[PDB]
Ligand binder design. Structure first.
Ligand SMILES: CC(C)(C)Nc1nc(C(F)(F)F)nc2ccc(-c3cccc(N)c3)cc12
Length: 294
């Protein structure tokens, strides 16, 4: 597009590159995503257009959609970094606990807002949570995820990650719920306290068996229905559930209560965003600022 000085490339999305740009109309700085090519479908457009009205402090704002002859451009507010890089920088340290539960609390607000309008994200992961220098964190690629996608390669042939994918999706359910995003957020929570990914699978069945080694192989008592799932196999090994105080040391007890409720197998039993926001863990939630290099 012509009203946009492209300043810097700042990434490979699942759908396209992202540039930092200046809007030469308004003088604003912007993240410009440039998606696909021919010929982009009606339904993608109609869906994505109306994301312009899904606004909240913790969703990154979608400023405009441009469809031109024949790519899609999405232009977003600009945030200076993502969670994965901040975790890598905080490696010897760990993000402080106050800042962990601040971020978790904000994401959990952003999620409750989306789920009250029945939109799922469904591909939540550290690199599409975006942070600023004032201490906010925001959900990016909301609704894109399942307007186009999710491919197992991106447009760069990059493998998309499995690490945060809920088990009902791995077991081949078509009609999953907002509980999907709660599973993912819980994996990310554990990765912040431990500084290590919780379930770093490198295929679907590896991913799936890594969950089983830690939470036990699921059955009909803990999850009614499991046994009927498309990709369930009688022949799955049966591991026993691990004691939860070694999975996420040294979270305190309120942190492990919350985590395990976000990681229940049965997606009807795991906790909602709304309900999570009432959990005792957030009794003393602060608002830390990351101070940050930029
Ligand atoms: C597509 C993907 C979600 C992977 N990434 C990003 N998407 C968008 C958005 F606004 F276009 F969504 N804006 C972004 C803004 C900044 C960054 C960014 C910039 C510098 C360092 C790191 N680690 C991430 C990544 C972004």
């Amino acid at each position: 597009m012509e009203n946009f000085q492209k300043v810097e490339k700042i990434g490979e999305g699942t759908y396209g590159v992202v540039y930092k740009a200046r809007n030469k109309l308004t003088g604003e700085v912007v993240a410009l995503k440039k998606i696909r090519t021919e010929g982009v479908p009606s339904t993608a457009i109609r869906e994505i257009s109306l994301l312009k009205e899904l606004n909240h402090p913790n969703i990154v704002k979608l400023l405009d959609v441009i469809h031109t002859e024949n790519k899609l451009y999405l232009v977003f507010e600009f945030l200076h970094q993502d969670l994965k890089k901040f975790m890598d920088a905080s490696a010897l340290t760990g993000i402080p606990l106050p800042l962990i539960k601040s971020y978790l609390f904000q994401l959990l607000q952003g999620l409750a807002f989306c789920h009250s309008h029945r939109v799922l994200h469904r591909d939540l992961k550290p690199q599409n949570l975006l942070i600023n220098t004032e201490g906010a964190i925001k959900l990016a690629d909301f609704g894109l995820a399942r307007a186009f996608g999710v491919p197992v390669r991106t447009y760069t042939h990059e493998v998309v990650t499995l690490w945060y994918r809920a088990p009902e999706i791995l077991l081949g359910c078509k009609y999953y719920s907002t509980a999907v995003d709660i599973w993912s957020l819980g994996c990310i929570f554990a990765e912040m306290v431990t500084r290590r990914a919780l379930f770093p699978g490198d295929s679907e069945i590896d991913q799936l068996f890594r969950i089983f080694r830690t939470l036990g192989t699921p059955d009909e008592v803990v999850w009614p229905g499991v046994t009927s799932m498309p990709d369930y196999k009688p022949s799955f090994p049966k591991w026993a559930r691990q004691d939860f105080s070694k999975v996420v040391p040294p979270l305190d007890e309120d942190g492990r209560s919350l985590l395990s409720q976000m990681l229940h197998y049965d997606p009807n039993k795991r906790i909602s965003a709304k309900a999570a926001l009432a959990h005792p863990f957030f009794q003393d939630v602060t608002k830390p600022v990351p101070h940050l290099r930029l």
